[PDB]
Amino acid sequence: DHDPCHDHTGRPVRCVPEFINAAFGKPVIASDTCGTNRPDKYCTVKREQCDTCDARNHFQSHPASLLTDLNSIGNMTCWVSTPSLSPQNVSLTLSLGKKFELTYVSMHFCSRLPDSMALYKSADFGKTWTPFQFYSSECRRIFGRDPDVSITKSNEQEAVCTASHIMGPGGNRVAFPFLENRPSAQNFENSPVLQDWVTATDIKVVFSRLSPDQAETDDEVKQRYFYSMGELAVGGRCKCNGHASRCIFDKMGRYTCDCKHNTAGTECEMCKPFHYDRPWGRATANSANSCVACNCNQHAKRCRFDAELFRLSGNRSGGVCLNCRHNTAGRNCHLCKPGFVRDTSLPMTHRKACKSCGCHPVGSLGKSCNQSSGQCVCKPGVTGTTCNRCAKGYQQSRSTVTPCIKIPHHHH
Ligand SMILES: *[C@@H]1O[C@H](CO[C@@H]2O[C@@H](C)[C@@H](O)[C@@H](O)[C@@H]2O)[C@@H](O[C@@H]2O[C@H](CO)[C@@H](O[C@@H]3O[C@H](CO[C@H]4O[C@H](CO)[C@@H](O)[C@H](O)[C@@H]4O)[C@@H](O)[C@H](O)[C@@H]3O)[C@H](O)[C@H]2NC(C)=O)[C@H](O[C@@H]2O[C@@H](C)[C@@H](O)[C@@H](O)[C@@H]2O)[C@H]1NC(C)=O
Ligand SMILES: *[C@@H]1O[C@H](CO)[C@@H](O)[C@H](O)[C@H]1NC(C)=O
Ligand SMILES: [Ca+2]
């Protein structure tokens, strides 16, 4: 149908997947959920209102799945942690299944806004995590960071910690935009540091403290300390480096880019086989940086990119063909192997572009012949196109070093 990766004439152009809420309809894995072991009373103030949380009944259950489901206008389904007068180390983990480039992470809390939480991302499918924003009324003591550290050109990946969520304008909704206040934001397409900043395969929210212990048996106030949230939204695009308009499931089940521009890899981050004439690049407004096919004059199955050759060509071509067949030779299989010669009547792409020199081994000095006329390298006294007969005045000797000696009594 419509390929947004080529313009109406067919020229390659930059293309990106559509911007989505990439959290939506994906599992969130909570470290703790109320009503898991036994019913649990929890209470929220508005007058105080208590409910029972029991995971065995749908009307009483608050699983993490509620975080990325469809919400009704006055009916927000909320996940709820287990009431404890000592709540901490409670985490939510979301797998995107694929690298995305993220614009924002939004959290819509239900009861109270948590005092201290940390946002992390992974870019290796959960193997490792780095922070990217903190929230706390005591950044220094809790998270070992100064509050509201200024972002300069020399710390654009700063993971800021702030207490400004507390009476913030979003109320119970907290949104972190990845590019806000980043100096290189307007130069994103030429900012590897920012391109790294916004790349993630997973997100993780870690809650450390509900309140600074500033907010009747203890079973009663226990029913007020709990984490609770109804909407986890992660806005971004599937990362394809400008070389795909959509991501798909291939026939092996992998979620991956629908790579265009003769690229390959799950992120279109390398060139396809036999497309190694130019270095890979990310597409930009100026140019798609489409990978370029090697030229092996129909004589080679594989090729490789040689960077120094590319730099010597004037940054034009850099593919080196591998194992040229059919007695061809050269980095483009554009020449003839030693002992062969360019059959001019056929094209270089023909399976018989290079015909044997046919040089008679005894009368010639080398197997290789004149690449233009085919004439072989004749020893003294030898003549012929392939140096296979003695010249006038010479006669076949016995030695194979000098097979033609002068004829005695023959005038020269
Ligand atoms: C918020 O939304 C939920 C989910 O309902 C869906 O979403 C809303 C937005 C709307 O689009 C609905 O049409 C959707 O279905 C509401 O919960 C649902 O409420 C209705 C009416 O009370 C209830 O229907 C009865 O179901 C009985 C059987 O119940 C059991 O079986 C179901 C199927 O296995 C389970 O899903 C259910 O949990 C029970 O275990 C049946 O005998 C009756 O004849 C009705 O048909 C739905 O089952 C119920 N879905 C649930 C609980 O998952 C919320 O409604 C609120 O909660 C329930 C418990 C009542 O107290 C409601 O009166 C109350 O309003 C809704 N909250 C709002 C609107 O404030
Ligand atoms: C929090 O829980 C994890 C998972 O068991 C554990 O590895 C970690 O040590 C706990 N505490 C802290 C302070 O990280
Ligand atoms: Ca919800």
PDB file of N, CA and C in Angstrom, residues 216-268:
ATOM      1  N   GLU A 216      -7.515   3.009  68.910  1.00  0.00           N
ATOM      2  CA  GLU A 216      -7.261   2.629  67.522  1.00  0.00           C
ATOM      3  C   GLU A 216      -6.069   1.673  67.410  1.00  0.00           C
ATOM      4  N   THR A 217      -6.341   0.371  67.282  1.00  0.00           N
ATOM      5  CA  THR A 217      -5.263  -0.596  67.096  1.00  0.00           C
ATOM      6  C   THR A 217      -4.495  -0.289  65.811  1.00  0.00           C
ATOM      7  N   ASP A 218      -3.218  -0.693  65.784  1.00  0.00           N
ATOM      8  CA  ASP A 218      -2.372  -0.437  64.619  1.00  0.00           C
ATOM      9  C   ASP A 218      -2.926  -1.061  63.344  1.00  0.00           C
ATOM     10  N   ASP A 219      -3.786  -2.077  63.465  1.00  0.00           N
ATOM     11  CA  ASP A 219      -4.487  -2.622  62.308  1.00  0.00           C
ATOM     12  C   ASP A 219      -5.331  -1.568  61.595  1.00  0.00           C
ATOM     13  N   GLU A 220      -5.629  -0.447  62.265  1.00  0.00           N
ATOM     14  CA  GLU A 220      -6.489   0.588  61.700  1.00  0.00           C
ATOM     15  C   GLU A 220      -5.705   1.550  60.809  1.00  0.00           C
ATOM     16  N   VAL A 221      -4.596   2.106  61.319  1.00  0.00           N
ATOM     17  CA  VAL A 221      -3.765   3.006  60.515  1.00  0.00           C
ATOM     18  C   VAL A 221      -2.975   2.233  59.467  1.00  0.00           C
ATOM     19  N   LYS A 222      -2.724   0.941  59.717  1.00  0.00           N
ATOM     20  CA  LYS A 222      -2.211   0.044  58.684  1.00  0.00           C
ATOM     21  C   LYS A 222      -3.050   0.144  57.422  1.00  0.00           C
ATOM     22  N   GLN A 223      -4.362   0.300  57.583  1.00  0.00           N
ATOM     23  CA  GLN A 223      -5.294   0.364  56.466  1.00  0.00           C
ATOM     24  C   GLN A 223      -5.210   1.666  55.680  1.00  0.00           C
ATOM     25  N   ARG A 224      -4.284   2.572  56.014  1.00  0.00           N
ATOM     26  CA  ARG A 224      -4.099   3.801  55.254  1.00  0.00           C
ATOM     27  C   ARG A 224      -2.769   3.873  54.520  1.00  0.00           C
ATOM     28  N   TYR A 225      -1.742   3.140  54.966  1.00  0.00           N
ATOM     29  CA  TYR A 225      -0.433   3.161  54.305  1.00  0.00           C
ATOM     30  C   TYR A 225      -0.388   2.060  53.252  1.00  0.00           C
ATOM     31  N   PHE A 226      -0.455   2.477  51.992  1.00  0.00           N
ATOM     32  CA  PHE A 226      -0.376   1.580  50.855  1.00  0.00           C
ATOM     33  C   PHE A 226      -0.138   2.411  49.608  1.00  0.00           C
ATOM     34  N   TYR A 227       0.581   1.816  48.667  1.00  0.00           N
ATOM     35  CA  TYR A 227       0.731   2.383  47.343  1.00  0.00           C
ATOM     36  C   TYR A 227      -0.443   1.976  46.462  1.00  0.00           C
ATOM     37  N   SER A 228      -0.800   2.858  45.526  1.00  0.00           N
ATOM     38  CA  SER A 228      -1.987   2.657  44.699  1.00  0.00           C
ATOM     39  C   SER A 228      -1.972   3.545  43.463  1.00  0.00           C
ATOM     40  N   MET A 229      -2.274   2.980  42.295  1.00  0.00           N
ATOM     41  CA  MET A 229      -2.102   3.709  41.048  1.00  0.00           C
ATOM     42  C   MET A 229      -3.024   3.123  39.983  1.00  0.00           C
ATOM     43  N   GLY A 230      -3.612   3.986  39.160  1.00  0.00           N
ATOM     44  CA  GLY A 230      -4.568   3.519  38.178  1.00  0.00           C
ATOM     45  C   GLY A 230      -4.200   3.648  36.709  1.00  0.00           C
ATOM     46  N   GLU A 231      -3.065   4.263  36.381  1.00  0.00           N
ATOM     47  CA  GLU A 231      -2.719   4.458  34.973  1.00  0.00           C
ATOM     48  C   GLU A 231      -1.210   4.627  34.866  1.00  0.00           C
ATOM     49  N   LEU A 232      -0.563   3.675  34.205  1.00  0.00           N
ATOM     50  CA  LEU A 232       0.849   3.766  33.846  1.00  0.00           C
ATOM     51  C   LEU A 232       0.925   3.922  32.326  1.00  0.00           C
ATOM     52  N   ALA A 233       1.302   5.107  31.860  1.00  0.00           N
ATOM     53  CA  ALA A 233       1.391   5.374  30.433  1.00  0.00           C
ATOM     54  C   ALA A 233       2.839   5.699  30.064  1.00  0.00           C
ATOM     55  N   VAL A 234       3.325   5.082  28.993  1.00  0.00           N
ATOM     56  CA  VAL A 234       4.689   5.274  28.509  1.00  0.00           C
ATOM     57  C   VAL A 234       4.602   5.670  27.039  1.00  0.00           C
ATOM     58  N   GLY A 235       4.796   6.957  26.752  1.00  0.00           N
ATOM     59  CA  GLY A 235       4.611   7.483  25.405  1.00  0.00           C
ATOM     60  C   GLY A 235       5.914   7.444  24.628  1.00  0.00           C
ATOM     61  N   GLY A 236       5.865   6.867  23.435  1.00  0.00           N
ATOM     62  CA  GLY A 236       7.058   6.838  22.613  1.00  0.00           C
ATOM     63  C   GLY A 236       6.817   6.188  21.271  1.00  0.00           C
ATOM     64  N   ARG A 237       7.922   5.797  20.641  1.00  0.00           N
ATOM     65  CA  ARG A 237       7.918   5.146  19.341  1.00  0.00           C
ATOM     66  C   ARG A 237       8.848   3.948  19.374  1.00  0.00           C
ATOM     67  N   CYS A 238       8.441   2.893  18.680  1.00  0.00           N
ATOM     68  CA  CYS A 238       9.297   1.746  18.428  1.00  0.00           C
ATOM     69  C   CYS A 238      10.567   2.208  17.707  1.00  0.00           C
ATOM     70  N   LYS A 239      11.737   1.854  18.251  1.00  0.00           N
ATOM     71  CA  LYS A 239      13.014   2.378  17.754  1.00  0.00           C
ATOM     72  C   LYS A 239      13.462   1.606  16.506  1.00  0.00           C
ATOM     73  N   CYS A 240      13.511   2.294  15.362  1.00  0.00           N
ATOM     74  CA  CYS A 240      13.934   1.666  14.119  1.00  0.00           C
ATOM     75  C   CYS A 240      14.949   2.508  13.368  1.00  0.00           C
ATOM     76  N   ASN A 241      15.437   3.587  13.982  1.00  0.00           N
ATOM     77  CA  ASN A 241      16.541   4.364  13.450  1.00  0.00           C
ATOM     78  C   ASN A 241      16.176   5.065  12.149  1.00  0.00           C
ATOM     79  N   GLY A 242      14.911   5.394  11.967  1.00  0.00           N
ATOM     80  CA  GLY A 242      14.511   6.079  10.759  1.00  0.00           C
ATOM     81  C   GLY A 242      14.290   5.191   9.561  1.00  0.00           C
ATOM     82  N   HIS A 243      14.395   3.870   9.717  1.00  0.00           N
ATOM     83  CA  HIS A 243      14.346   2.975   8.566  1.00  0.00           C
ATOM     84  C   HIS A 243      13.103   2.088   8.537  1.00  0.00           C
ATOM     85  N   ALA A 244      12.056   2.412   9.315  1.00  0.00           N
ATOM     86  CA  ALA A 244      10.819   1.635   9.274  1.00  0.00           C
ATOM     87  C   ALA A 244       9.625   2.473   9.745  1.00  0.00           C
ATOM     88  N   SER A 245       8.464   2.255   9.122  1.00  0.00           N
ATOM     89  CA  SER A 245       7.237   2.921   9.552  1.00  0.00           C
ATOM     90  C   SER A 245       6.421   2.101  10.539  1.00  0.00           C
ATOM     91  N   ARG A 246       6.728   0.821  10.719  1.00  0.00           N
ATOM     92  CA  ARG A 246       5.982   0.021  11.676  1.00  0.00           C
ATOM     93  C   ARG A 246       6.866  -1.076  12.251  1.00  0.00           C
ATOM     94  N   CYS A 247       6.427  -1.597  13.396  1.00  0.00           N
ATOM     95  CA  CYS A 247       6.957  -2.804  14.014  1.00  0.00           C
ATOM     96  C   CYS A 247       5.900  -3.908  13.995  1.00  0.00           C
ATOM     97  N   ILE A 248       6.363  -5.150  13.924  1.00  0.00           N
ATOM     98  CA  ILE A 248       5.518  -6.295  13.621  1.00  0.00           C
ATOM     99  C   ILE A 248       6.021  -7.518  14.385  1.00  0.00           C
ATOM    100  N   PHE A 249       5.268  -8.603  14.291  1.00  0.00           N
ATOM    101  CA  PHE A 249       5.741  -9.908  14.727  1.00  0.00           C
ATOM    102  C   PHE A 249       6.148 -10.710  13.504  1.00  0.00           C
ATOM    103  N   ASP A 250       7.416 -11.108  13.435  1.00  0.00           N
ATOM    104  CA  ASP A 250       7.845 -11.922  12.308  1.00  0.00           C
ATOM    105  C   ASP A 250       7.335 -13.345  12.473  1.00  0.00           C
ATOM    106  N   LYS A 251       7.619 -14.178  11.476  1.00  0.00           N
ATOM    107  CA  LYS A 251       7.130 -15.548  11.493  1.00  0.00           C
ATOM    108  C   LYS A 251       7.769 -16.393  12.587  1.00  0.00           C
ATOM    109  N   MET A 252       8.745 -15.857  13.322  1.00  0.00           N
ATOM    110  CA  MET A 252       9.319 -16.541  14.473  1.00  0.00           C
ATOM    111  C   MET A 252       8.755 -16.036  15.796  1.00  0.00           C
ATOM    112  N   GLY A 253       7.828 -15.082  15.765  1.00  0.00           N
ATOM    113  CA  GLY A 253       7.229 -14.565  16.973  1.00  0.00           C
ATOM    114  C   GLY A 253       7.931 -13.375  17.584  1.00  0.00           C
ATOM    115  N   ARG A 254       9.040 -12.926  17.009  1.00  0.00           N
ATOM    116  CA  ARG A 254       9.777 -11.812  17.581  1.00  0.00           C
ATOM    117  C   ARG A 254       9.120 -10.498  17.189  1.00  0.00           C
ATOM    118  N   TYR A 255       8.947  -9.622  18.170  1.00  0.00           N
ATOM    119  CA  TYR A 255       8.523  -8.260  17.899  1.00  0.00           C
ATOM    120  C   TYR A 255       9.728  -7.503  17.374  1.00  0.00           C
ATOM    121  N   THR A 256       9.591  -6.915  16.187  1.00  0.00           N
ATOM    122  CA  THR A 256      10.740  -6.323  15.507  1.00  0.00           C
ATOM    123  C   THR A 256      10.281  -5.281  14.493  1.00  0.00           C
ATOM    124  N   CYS A 257      11.204  -4.382  14.143  1.00  0.00           N
ATOM    125  CA  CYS A 257      10.950  -3.393  13.104  1.00  0.00           C
ATOM    126  C   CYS A 257      10.709  -4.056  11.753  1.00  0.00           C
ATOM    127  N   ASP A 258       9.881  -3.407  10.931  1.00  0.00           N
ATOM    128  CA  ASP A 258       9.706  -3.817   9.539  1.00  0.00           C
ATOM    129  C   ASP A 258      10.717  -3.043   8.694  1.00  0.00           C
ATOM    130  N   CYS A 259      11.971  -3.495   8.761  1.00  0.00           N
ATOM    131  CA  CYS A 259      13.096  -2.697   8.277  1.00  0.00           C
ATOM    132  C   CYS A 259      13.003  -2.435   6.781  1.00  0.00           C
ATOM    133  N   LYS A 260      13.247  -1.190   6.401  1.00  0.00           N
ATOM    134  CA  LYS A 260      13.388  -0.759   5.020  1.00  0.00           C
ATOM    135  C   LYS A 260      14.819  -0.253   4.797  1.00  0.00           C
ATOM    136  N   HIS A 261      15.087   0.238   3.587  1.00  0.00           N
ATOM    137  CA  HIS A 261      16.359   0.883   3.255  1.00  0.00           C
ATOM    138  C   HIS A 261      17.528  -0.098   3.293  1.00  0.00           C
ATOM    139  N   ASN A 262      17.261  -1.344   2.895  1.00  0.00           N
ATOM    140  CA  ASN A 262      18.256  -2.426   2.877  1.00  0.00           C
ATOM    141  C   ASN A 262      18.987  -2.551   4.213  1.00  0.00           C
ATOM    142  N   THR A 263      18.265  -2.303   5.308  1.00  0.00           N
ATOM    143  CA  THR A 263      18.775  -2.534   6.652  1.00  0.00           C
ATOM    144  C   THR A 263      18.210  -3.833   7.219  1.00  0.00           C
ATOM    145  N   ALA A 264      18.750  -4.215   8.367  1.00  0.00           N
ATOM    146  CA  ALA A 264      18.328  -5.411   9.073  1.00  0.00           C
ATOM    147  C   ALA A 264      18.577  -5.194  10.558  1.00  0.00           C
ATOM    148  N   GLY A 265      18.288  -6.225  11.345  1.00  0.00           N
ATOM    149  CA  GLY A 265      18.356  -6.143  12.788  1.00  0.00           C
ATOM    150  C   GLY A 265      17.024  -5.714  13.380  1.00  0.00           C
ATOM    151  N   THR A 266      16.832  -6.050  14.656  1.00  0.00           N
ATOM    152  CA  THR A 266      15.547  -5.732  15.257  1.00  0.00           C
ATOM    153  C   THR A 266      15.316  -4.225  15.278  1.00  0.00           C
ATOM    154  N   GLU A 267      16.384  -3.418  15.361  1.00  0.00           N
ATOM    155  CA  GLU A 267      16.247  -1.964  15.334  1.00  0.00           C
ATOM    156  C   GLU A 267      16.667  -1.332  14.007  1.00  0.00           C
ATOM    157  N   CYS A 268      16.738  -2.113  12.915  1.00  0.00           N
ATOM    158  CA  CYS A 268      17.292  -1.621  11.641  1.00  0.00           C
ATOM    159  C   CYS A 268      18.673  -0.963  11.819  1.00  0.00           C
TER     160      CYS A 268
END
